Amino acid sequence: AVPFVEDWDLVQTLGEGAYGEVQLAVNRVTEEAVAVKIVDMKRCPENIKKEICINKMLNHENVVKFYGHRREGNIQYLFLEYCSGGELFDRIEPDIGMPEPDAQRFFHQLMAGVVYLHGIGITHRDIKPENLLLDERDNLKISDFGLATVFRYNNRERLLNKMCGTLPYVAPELLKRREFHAEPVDVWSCGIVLTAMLAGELPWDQPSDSCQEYSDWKEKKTYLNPWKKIDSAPLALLHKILVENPSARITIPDIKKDRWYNKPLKKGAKRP
Ligand SMILES: OCCNc1ncnc2oc(-c3ccccc3)c(-c3ccccc3)c12
């Protein structure tokens, strides 16, 4: 009945990527703010159709909400939850990181999102601080399901063989093996995000034997740059996450049992 409720004003650009651009859209009547992902199909018709498909399945507090999609000619418009706090990346101070209580709360919320995704049989495949967005209250939301896929369907696990993600966040098995389980890969990337949050630096360019920094970690040289700035409790968790063998790697149910994970560190809202 409301005459102008369907109208949305494109106020400002939020960022320009490879697929296209993301714009801030504000409703004409309600003044509700949403983000619109603009992707040129004529300048990928395959990777975007799967992104919409996965987004349709998801409904969680730590996952960027999907409102709908419009197919105006060639351009695909993806209406998503606006996260005003920006990326977790910009909350990480270079070579220092962030306060340990902040990192723990972000990691808690990250695990909550990943648990949900894995429970519905989907893997993100590109977990990194650039893809972890913050809302008005600093709540973490997992974003960008353009590289995501189904790893469990009708209670049968499908092994992955496609190499994707981001090299510094990638698990060693996807560079080493033809086939690999989906879940430990996401777990590994979550560990690299934790390292970044607590040290303000990435441990290695890639998890390979040719990489000196990765070889030092396997040699347990925790006296070196990233690990020496972390602290024993969270480092002990990192020792369990960043395990080369994905079969010996800690699972999320066991991460929730970890000492540092359950260590009281963070207070609530400021007098509220
Ligand atoms: O879901 C992926 C689309 N991206 C977004 N989705 C949903 N909400 C968002 O808020 C942002 C954003 C918010 C505040 C400042 C800057 C960016 C962005 C944003 C857009 C482009 C590149 C990186 C981040 C964003």
User: Is residue 159 located within the same domain as residue 263?
Assistant: yes
Beta bridge partners of 71: 76
8 A C-beta contact, residue 148 and residue 122: yes
How far, in Å, is the centroid of ligand 1 from the Cα of 112?
A: 21
How far is it, in rounded angstroms, from Cα 214 to Cα 126? 20
Last residue of a domain, one of 69, 93, 117: 93
Query: Considering only CA atoms, which of 123, 231, 200 is closest in space to residue 222?
Result: 231
Q: Which of 9, 90, 126, 135 is catalytic?
A: 126
User: Is residue 110 located within the same domain as residue 191?
Assistant: yes
HSE at residue 125, side-chain half, CA atoms within 13 A, is 22
Specify whether 254 is catalytic. no
How far is it, in rounded angstroms, from Cα 163 to Cα 179? 10
How far is it, in rounded angstroms, from Cα 65 to Cα 61? 8
Please indicate whether residue 144, judged by its CB atom, sits closer than 6 Å to ligand 1: yes
User: Is residue 71 located within the same domain as residue 168?
Assistant: no
User: Is residue 10 located within the same domain as residue 45?
Assistant: yes
How far is it, in rounded angstroms, from Cα 20 to Cα 38? 6
8 A C-beta contact, residue 6 and residue 29: no
Which residue bears the tokens 């990765």? Answer: 214
**HEC states along the chain?**
CCCCCCCEEEEEEEEECCCEEEEEEEECCCCCEEEEEEEECCCCCCHHHHHHHHHHHCCCCCECCEEEEEEECCEEEEEEECCCCEEHHHHCECCCECCHHHHHHHHHHHHHHHHHHHHCCEECCCCCHHHEEECCCCCEEECCCCCCEECEECCEECCECCCCCCHHHCCHHHHHCCCECHHHHHHHHHHHHHHHHHHCCCCCCCCCCCCHHHHHHHCCCCCCHHHHCCCHHHHHHHHHHCCCCCCCCCCHHHHCCCCCCCCCCCCCCCCC
User: Is residue 4 located within the same domain as residue 123?
Assistant: no
8 A C-beta contact, residue 191 and residue 250: no
16, 117, 131, 149 from 146: Cα distances, Å? 16, 14, 11, 9
The reply to whether 17 sits in an annotated binding site is yes
Burial of 71 (0-12, 13-18, 19+ CB in 10 A): exposed
8 A C-beta contact, residue 194 and residue 238: yes
Last residue of a domain, one of 93, 128, 147: 93
Please indicate whether residue 35, judged by its CB atom, sits closer than 6 Å to ligand 1: yes
Helices 232-241 and 182-199, axial angle in degrees (round to 10): 150
The domain in which residue 232 lies consists of 94-272
Rg (C-alpha) for the chain, rounded Å, is: 20
Contacts of 7 (CB under 8 A, 6+ apart): 27, 28, 29
User: Is residue 88 located within the same domain as residue 98?
Assistant: no
Ligand 1: which residue has its CA nearest to atom 12?
86
Mutation pick for ligand 1 pocket among 14, 32, 76 (CB with most ligand atoms within 8 Å): 14
Method used to obtain the model = X-ray
User: Is residue 191 located within the same domain as residue 272?
Assistant: yes
User: Is residue 99 located within the same domain as residue 59?
Assistant: no
Last residue of a domain, one of 93, 116, 146: 93
User: Is residue 77 located within the same domain as residue 99?
Assistant: no
Beta bridge partners of 142: 63, 132
Q: What angle do CA 62, 67, 73 make, to 5 degrees?
A: 135
Total tally of structural domains belonging to the chain: 2
**Structure's resolution in angstroms:** 2.1
User: Is residue 9 located within the same domain as residue 111?
Assistant: no
The reply to whether 16 sits in an annotated binding site is yes
User: Is residue 78 located within the same domain as residue 100?
Assistant: no
User: Is residue 84 located within the same domain as residue 101?
Assistant: no
